[PDB]
PDB file of C-alpha atoms and ligand atoms in Angstrom:
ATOM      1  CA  UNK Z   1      -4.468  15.644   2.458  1.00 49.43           C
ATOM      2  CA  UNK Z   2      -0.883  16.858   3.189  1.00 48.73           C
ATOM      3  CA  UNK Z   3       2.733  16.674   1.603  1.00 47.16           C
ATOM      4  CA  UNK Z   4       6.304  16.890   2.430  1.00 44.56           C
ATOM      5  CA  UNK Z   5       8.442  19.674   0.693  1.00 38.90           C
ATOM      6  CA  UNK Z   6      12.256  19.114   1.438  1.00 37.10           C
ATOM      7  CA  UNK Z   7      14.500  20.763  -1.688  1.00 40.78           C
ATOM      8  CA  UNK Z   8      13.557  20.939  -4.647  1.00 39.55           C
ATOM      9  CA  UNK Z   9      10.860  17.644  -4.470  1.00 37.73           C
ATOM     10  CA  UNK Z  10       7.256  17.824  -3.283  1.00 39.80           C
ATOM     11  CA  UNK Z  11       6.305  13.791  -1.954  1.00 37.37           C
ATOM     12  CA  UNK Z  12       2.555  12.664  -1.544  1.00 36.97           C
ATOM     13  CA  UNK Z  13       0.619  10.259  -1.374  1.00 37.38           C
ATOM     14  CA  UNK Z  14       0.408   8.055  -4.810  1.00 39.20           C
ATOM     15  CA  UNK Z  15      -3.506   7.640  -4.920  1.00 39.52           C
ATOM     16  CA  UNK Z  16      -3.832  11.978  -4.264  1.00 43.26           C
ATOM     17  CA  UNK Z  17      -1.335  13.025  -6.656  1.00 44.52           C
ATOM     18  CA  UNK Z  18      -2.723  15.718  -9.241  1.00 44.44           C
ATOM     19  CA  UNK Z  19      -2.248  16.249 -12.803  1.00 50.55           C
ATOM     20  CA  UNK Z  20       0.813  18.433 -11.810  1.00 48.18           C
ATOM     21  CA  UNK Z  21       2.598  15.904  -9.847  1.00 49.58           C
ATOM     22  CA  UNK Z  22       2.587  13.747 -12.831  1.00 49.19           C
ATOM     23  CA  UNK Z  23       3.496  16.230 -15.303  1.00 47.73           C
ATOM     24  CA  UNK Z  24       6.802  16.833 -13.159  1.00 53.42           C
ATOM     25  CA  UNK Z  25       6.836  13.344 -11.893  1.00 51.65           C
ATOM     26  CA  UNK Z  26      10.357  12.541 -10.226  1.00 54.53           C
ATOM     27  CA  UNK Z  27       9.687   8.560  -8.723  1.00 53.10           C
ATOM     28  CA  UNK Z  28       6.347   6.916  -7.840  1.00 52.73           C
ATOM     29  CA  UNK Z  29       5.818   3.230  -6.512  1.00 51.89           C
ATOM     30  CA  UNK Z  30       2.363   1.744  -5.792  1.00 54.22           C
ATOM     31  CA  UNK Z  31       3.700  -0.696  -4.268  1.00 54.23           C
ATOM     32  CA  UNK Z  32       5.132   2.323  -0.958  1.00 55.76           C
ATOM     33  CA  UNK Z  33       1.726   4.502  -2.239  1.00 58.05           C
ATOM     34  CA  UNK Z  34       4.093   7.399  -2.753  1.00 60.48           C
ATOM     35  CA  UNK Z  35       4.807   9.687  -5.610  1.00 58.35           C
ATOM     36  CA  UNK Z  36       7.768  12.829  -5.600  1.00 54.65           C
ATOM     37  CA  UNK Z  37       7.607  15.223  -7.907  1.00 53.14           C
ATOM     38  CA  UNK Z  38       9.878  18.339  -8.747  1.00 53.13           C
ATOM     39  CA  UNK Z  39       9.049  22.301  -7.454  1.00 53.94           C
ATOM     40  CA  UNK Z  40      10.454  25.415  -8.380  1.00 55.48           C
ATOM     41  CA  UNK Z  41      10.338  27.067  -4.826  1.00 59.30           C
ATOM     42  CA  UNK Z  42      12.793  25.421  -2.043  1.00 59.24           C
ATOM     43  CA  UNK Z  43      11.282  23.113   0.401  1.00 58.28           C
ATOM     44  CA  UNK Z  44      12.275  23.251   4.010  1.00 59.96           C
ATOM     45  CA  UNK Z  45      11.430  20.458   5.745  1.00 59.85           C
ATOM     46  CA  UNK Z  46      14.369  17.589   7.324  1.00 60.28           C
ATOM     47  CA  UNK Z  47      13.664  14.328   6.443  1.00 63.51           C
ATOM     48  CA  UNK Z  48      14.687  11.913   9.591  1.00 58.80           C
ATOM     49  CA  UNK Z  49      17.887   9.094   8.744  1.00 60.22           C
ATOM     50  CA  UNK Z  50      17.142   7.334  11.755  1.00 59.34           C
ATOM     51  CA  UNK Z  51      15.547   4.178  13.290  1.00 59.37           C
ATOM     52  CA  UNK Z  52      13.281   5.836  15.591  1.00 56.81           C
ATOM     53  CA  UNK Z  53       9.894   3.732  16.625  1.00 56.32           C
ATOM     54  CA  UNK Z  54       8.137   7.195  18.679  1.00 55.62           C
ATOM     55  CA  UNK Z  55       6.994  10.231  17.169  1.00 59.34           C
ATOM     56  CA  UNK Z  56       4.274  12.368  16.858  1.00 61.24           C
ATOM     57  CA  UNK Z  57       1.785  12.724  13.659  1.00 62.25           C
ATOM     58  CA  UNK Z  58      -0.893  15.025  12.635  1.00 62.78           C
ATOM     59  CA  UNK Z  59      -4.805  13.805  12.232  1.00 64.32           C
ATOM     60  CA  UNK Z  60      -6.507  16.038  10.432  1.00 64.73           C
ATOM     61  CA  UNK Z  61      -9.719  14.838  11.553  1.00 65.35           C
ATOM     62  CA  UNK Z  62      -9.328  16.253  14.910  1.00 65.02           C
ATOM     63  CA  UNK Z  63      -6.703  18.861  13.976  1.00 67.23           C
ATOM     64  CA  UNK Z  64      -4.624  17.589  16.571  1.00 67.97           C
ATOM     65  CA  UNK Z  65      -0.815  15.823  16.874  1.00 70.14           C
ATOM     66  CA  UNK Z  66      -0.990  12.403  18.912  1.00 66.88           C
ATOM     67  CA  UNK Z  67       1.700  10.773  19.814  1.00 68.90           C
ATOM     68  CA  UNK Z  68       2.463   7.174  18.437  1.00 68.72           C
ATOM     69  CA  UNK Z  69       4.668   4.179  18.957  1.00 68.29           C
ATOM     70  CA  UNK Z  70       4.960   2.860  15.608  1.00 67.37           C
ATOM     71  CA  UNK Z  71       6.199  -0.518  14.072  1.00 64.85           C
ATOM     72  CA  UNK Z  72       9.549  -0.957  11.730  1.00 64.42           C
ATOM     73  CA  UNK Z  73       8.424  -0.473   8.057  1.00 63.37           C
ATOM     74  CA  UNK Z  74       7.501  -3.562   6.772  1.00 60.60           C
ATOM     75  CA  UNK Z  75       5.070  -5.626   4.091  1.00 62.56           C
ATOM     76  CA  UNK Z  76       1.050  -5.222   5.528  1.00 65.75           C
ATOM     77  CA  UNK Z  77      -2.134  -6.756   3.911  1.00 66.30           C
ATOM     78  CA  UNK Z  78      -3.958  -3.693   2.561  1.00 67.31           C
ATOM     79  CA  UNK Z  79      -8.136  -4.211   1.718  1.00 63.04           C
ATOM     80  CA  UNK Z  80      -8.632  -3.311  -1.005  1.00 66.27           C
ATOM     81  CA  UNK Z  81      -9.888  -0.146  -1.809  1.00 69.83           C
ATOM     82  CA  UNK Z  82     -11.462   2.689  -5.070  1.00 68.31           C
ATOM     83  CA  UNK Z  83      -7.785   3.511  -5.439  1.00 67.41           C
ATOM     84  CA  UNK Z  84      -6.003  -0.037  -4.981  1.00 65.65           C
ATOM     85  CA  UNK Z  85      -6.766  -3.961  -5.071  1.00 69.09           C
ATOM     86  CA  UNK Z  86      -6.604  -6.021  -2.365  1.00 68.72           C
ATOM     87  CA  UNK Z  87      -2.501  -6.097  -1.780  1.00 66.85           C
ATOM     88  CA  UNK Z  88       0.739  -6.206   0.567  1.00 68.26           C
ATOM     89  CA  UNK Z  89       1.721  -2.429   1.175  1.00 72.10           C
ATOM     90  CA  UNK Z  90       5.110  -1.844   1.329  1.00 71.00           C
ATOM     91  CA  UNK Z  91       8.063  -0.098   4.026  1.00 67.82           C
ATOM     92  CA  UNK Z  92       4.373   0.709   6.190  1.00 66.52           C
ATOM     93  CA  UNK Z  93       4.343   1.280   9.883  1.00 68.01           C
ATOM     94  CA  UNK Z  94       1.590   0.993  12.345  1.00 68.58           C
ATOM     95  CA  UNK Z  95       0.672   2.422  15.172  1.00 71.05           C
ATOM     96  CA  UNK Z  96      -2.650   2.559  17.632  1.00 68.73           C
ATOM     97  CA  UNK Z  97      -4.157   6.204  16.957  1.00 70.26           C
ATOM     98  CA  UNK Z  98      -7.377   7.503  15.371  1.00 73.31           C
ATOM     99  CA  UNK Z  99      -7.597   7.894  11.506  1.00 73.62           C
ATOM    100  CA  UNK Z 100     -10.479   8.024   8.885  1.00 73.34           C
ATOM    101  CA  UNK Z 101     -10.463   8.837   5.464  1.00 73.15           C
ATOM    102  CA  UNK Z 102      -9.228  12.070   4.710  1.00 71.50           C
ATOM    103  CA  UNK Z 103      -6.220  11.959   7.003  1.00 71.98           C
ATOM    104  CA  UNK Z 104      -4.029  10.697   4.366  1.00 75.04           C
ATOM    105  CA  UNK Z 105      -0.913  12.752   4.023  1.00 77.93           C
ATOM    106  CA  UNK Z 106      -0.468  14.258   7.635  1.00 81.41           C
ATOM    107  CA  UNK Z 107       3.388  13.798   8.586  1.00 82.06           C
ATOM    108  CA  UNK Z 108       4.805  11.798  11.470  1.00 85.98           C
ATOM    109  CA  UNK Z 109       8.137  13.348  13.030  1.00 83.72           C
ATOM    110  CA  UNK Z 110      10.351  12.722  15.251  1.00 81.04           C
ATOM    111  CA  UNK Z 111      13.216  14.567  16.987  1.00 83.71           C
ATOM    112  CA  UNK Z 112      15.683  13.808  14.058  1.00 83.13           C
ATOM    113  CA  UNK Z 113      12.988  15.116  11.510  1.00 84.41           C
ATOM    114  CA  UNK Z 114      10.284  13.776   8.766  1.00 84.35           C
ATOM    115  CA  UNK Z 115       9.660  10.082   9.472  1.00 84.10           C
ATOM    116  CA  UNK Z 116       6.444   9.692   7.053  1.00 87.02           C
ATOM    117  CA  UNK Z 117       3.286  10.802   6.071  1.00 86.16           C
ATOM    118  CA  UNK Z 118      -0.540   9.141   7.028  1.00 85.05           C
ATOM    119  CA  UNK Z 119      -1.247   6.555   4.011  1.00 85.75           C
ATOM    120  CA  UNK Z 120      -4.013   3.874   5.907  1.00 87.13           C
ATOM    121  CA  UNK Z 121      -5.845   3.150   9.004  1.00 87.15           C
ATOM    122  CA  UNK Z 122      -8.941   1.884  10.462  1.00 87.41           C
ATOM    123  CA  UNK Z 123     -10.565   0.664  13.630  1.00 90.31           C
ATOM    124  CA  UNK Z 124      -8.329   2.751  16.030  1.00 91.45           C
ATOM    125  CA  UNK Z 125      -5.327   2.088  13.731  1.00 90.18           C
ATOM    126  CA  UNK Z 126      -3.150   4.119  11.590  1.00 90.19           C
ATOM    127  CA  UNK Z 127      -0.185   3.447   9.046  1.00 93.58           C
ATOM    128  CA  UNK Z 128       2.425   5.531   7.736  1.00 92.12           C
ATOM    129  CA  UNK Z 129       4.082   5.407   4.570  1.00 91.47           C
ATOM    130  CA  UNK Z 130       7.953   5.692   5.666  1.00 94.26           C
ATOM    131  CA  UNK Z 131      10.294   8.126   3.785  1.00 95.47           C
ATOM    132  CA  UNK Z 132      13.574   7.814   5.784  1.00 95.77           C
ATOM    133  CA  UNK Z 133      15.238   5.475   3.415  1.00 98.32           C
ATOM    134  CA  UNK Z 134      14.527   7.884   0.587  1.00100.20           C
ATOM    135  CA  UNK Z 135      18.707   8.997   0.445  1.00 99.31           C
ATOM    136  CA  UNK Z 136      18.091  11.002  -2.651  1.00100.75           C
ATOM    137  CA  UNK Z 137      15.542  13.400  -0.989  1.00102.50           C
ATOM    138  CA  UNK Z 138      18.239  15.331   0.484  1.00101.37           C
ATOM    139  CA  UNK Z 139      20.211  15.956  -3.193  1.00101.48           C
TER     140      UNK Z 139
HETATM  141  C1  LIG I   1      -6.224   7.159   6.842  1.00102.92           C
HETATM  142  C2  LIG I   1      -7.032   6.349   5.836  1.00102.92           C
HETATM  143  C3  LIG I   1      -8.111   5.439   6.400  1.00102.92           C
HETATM  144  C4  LIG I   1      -8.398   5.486   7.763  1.00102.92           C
HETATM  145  C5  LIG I   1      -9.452   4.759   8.298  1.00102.92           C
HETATM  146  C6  LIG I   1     -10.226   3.966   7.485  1.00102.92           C
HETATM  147  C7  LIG I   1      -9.939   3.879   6.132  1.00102.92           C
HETATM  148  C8  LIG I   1      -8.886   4.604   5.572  1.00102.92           C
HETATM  149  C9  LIG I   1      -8.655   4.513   4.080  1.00102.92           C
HETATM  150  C10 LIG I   1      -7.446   3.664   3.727  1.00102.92           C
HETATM  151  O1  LIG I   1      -6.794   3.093   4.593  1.00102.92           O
HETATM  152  N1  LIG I   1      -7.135   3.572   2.413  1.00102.92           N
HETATM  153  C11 LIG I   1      -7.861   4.260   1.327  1.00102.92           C
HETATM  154  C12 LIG I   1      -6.918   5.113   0.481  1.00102.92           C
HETATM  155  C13 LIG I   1      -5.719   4.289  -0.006  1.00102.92           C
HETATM  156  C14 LIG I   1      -5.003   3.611   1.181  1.00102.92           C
HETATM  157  C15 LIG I   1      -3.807   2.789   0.729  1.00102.92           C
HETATM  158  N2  LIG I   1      -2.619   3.216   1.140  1.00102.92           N
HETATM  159  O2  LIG I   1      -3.958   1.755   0.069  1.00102.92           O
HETATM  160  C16 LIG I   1      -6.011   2.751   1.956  1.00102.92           C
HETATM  161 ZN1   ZN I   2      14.352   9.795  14.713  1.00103.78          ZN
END
């Protein structure tokens, strides 16, 4: 589980969105697995505008930050899943680093800021859904 909160938008995962985030649904793609939806309250995290391939991201399964090198964001066979056919995930990056299910939604950072948050993994992988082309985040 875990979300990013920069203004007045709240962005998750698609597949763990609640009844909530639909109700004041903003933008959602299944394609990216990512859903925004509006708060009342300010949000204070920076979302990154850069092309960074290092960060750091937090695995909730060892409540620990690893660092990563992480590929460009880019089209990646997903299995598939209770939440999704079989499909090609879109603007994903991977990156060697333990996962399971349940880390979903931990946020990879870099200096400049947000980068992305956990969305798949497996075998000693893990994948991050990337929000740095998301322009509109910061208006
Ligand atoms: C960190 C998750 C994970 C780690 C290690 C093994 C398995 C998983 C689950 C997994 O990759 N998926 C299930 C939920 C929807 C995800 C999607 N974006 O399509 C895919
Ligand atoms: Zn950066």
């Amino acid at each position: 589980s875990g979300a990013i909160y920069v203004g007045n938008y709240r962005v998750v995962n698609r597949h763990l969105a609640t009844h909530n985030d639909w109700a004041n649904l903003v933008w959602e793609d299944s394609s990216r697995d990512l859903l925004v939806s509006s708060t009342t309250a300010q949000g204070c995290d920076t979302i990154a505008r850069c092309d960074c391939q290092t960060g750091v991201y937090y695995c909730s399964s060892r409540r620990k930050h690893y660092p990563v090198s992480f590929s460009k964001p880019s089209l990646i066979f997903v299995e598939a899943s209770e939440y999704y056919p079989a499909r090609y995930q879109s603007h994903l990056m991977l990156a060697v680093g333990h996962s399971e299910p349940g880390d979903c939604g931990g946020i990879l950072r870099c200096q400049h800021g947000v980068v992305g948050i956990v969305s798949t993994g497996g075998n000693g992988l893990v994948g991050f859904a990337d929000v740095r082309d998301l322009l509109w985040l910061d208006e």
